[PDB]
Structure 1
């Protein structure tokens, strides 16, 4: 299933996201506190979007071909990018609200994030080889500014909170730092880049990163005392 058997990872991704979503829905039933309810809506939406993306890729809706200037043809799962465009801002929104960061601060970070994702999409769609890597590079650079500001700006914002909140912040921050940094690598090593691995390994890698960065993150956030329970 798929082009070279990567269907299994799409199915598992769909399953992981679907069940992560339902779990988050279930745990949010009791909640009436408006702030806590916002956290829930955000964190439910993240795996929902990802579920829809995974589901569509599994059936082949989010897949296209790109002929490069050097003749090589790349299978591009563009739905991934549609996923990223929406879920990563929500993720920043989630940790922002937890951090007590200002609307200005969150917006700024969402901007950089959008640049990151879109530049990535541009990199993936470009048929000129050097340009692919130039876009990928620009994107990776902007990811660094993003991660830096997450640490410095969101970190500053949370610093007046109690030890429990700051501790949850650091844990989520660390999930972002580690897993987000691997995304550009996955692209570099997979079929969109150097093609050191095929579609099968690339999809597996994205699936793990996706599950950790969304379901795992969501889990840590919703079970924290910081969101009031």
Structure 2
């Protein structure tokens, strides 16, 4: 790619298509409207992400920023477009599985979308302390997201049968653990401190996205907690 990162973009692409395939194929033996609902939402997730990843491997959704630093940073802004559509969808999925109110769910995507958007400005500002600034409020907003996820969606599902509560716990644990890594991957890649470059950052976002989208969806879709 630009700095060897093209392999991750490609594996990421195919990893998403493969998970999407499995979900589709597993969609065939579905017989319940509530079940089909999680299926559409869940197939949608890596669909979109695969699109994003594919456009980046072609060389679309890739721009350059000149920082006041005098450093020039290579930004795959398509990630953010992807995340803007997909991360609310992940919130929808688990919120619906949790029995959370529509208001509860909206509350969360609201903060989520704020998160992705402040991440986008932190990625694009030429003023370098403003990159750290907007990264920080972006991480403050993520911490609140993750607080409200376990508190609010966890209280909502606390009266479900074991299957639903534990499928929920597993999902919320995939989110707690993988999402929390995103800002650290950002901080250490070219976008933040530039410890590792583009190569290391892409790979991490590639591993994290796959766990976050395919691993997530596989666990949810392989659960009867999404029937009714």
* Normalised TM-score (structure 1): 0.98
Once residues 33 and 168 of structure 1 are traced to their aligned partners in structure 2, the CA distance between those partners, rounded to angstroms, is: 18
Instruction: Give unpaired runs (5+ residues) of structure 1.
Output: none
Once residues 199 and 66 of structure 1 are traced to their aligned partners in structure 2, the CA distance between those partners, rounded to angstroms, is: 13
Deviation at 1:30, TM superposition (A): 2.5
Q: Per the alignment, in what secondary structure is the counterpart of residue 74 of structure 1?
A: strand
Deviations 1:176-205 (A, max 9, x none): 000000000010000000011011111110
Greater CA deviation, 95-104 or 23-32? 23-32
In the alignment, which residue of structure 2 is the partner of 1:106? Answer: 105
Instruction: Give unpaired runs (5+ residues) of structure 2.
Output: none
Q: Per the alignment, in what secondary structure is the counterpart of residue 196 of structure 2?
A: coil
What is the total number of aligned residue pairs between the two structures?
A: 228
Q: Per the alignment, in what secondary structure is the counterpart of residue 166 of structure 2?
A: helix
Deviation at 1:71, TM superposition (A): 1.3
RMSD: 0.9
Once residues 134 and 194 of structure 2 are traced to their aligned partners in structure 1, the CA distance between those partners, rounded to angstroms, is: 17
Deviations 1:148-184 (A, max 9, x none): 0000000000011001110000000000000000000
Deviations 1:7-32 (A, max 9, x none): 11000000000111111111112323
Q: How does 1:19-30 map to 2 (within 5 A)?
A: 19-30=18-29
Deviations 1:59-90 (A, max 9, x none): 00010001111211000000000010000000
Once residues 29 and 204 of structure 2 are traced to their aligned partners in structure 1, the CA distance between those partners, rounded to angstroms, is: 35
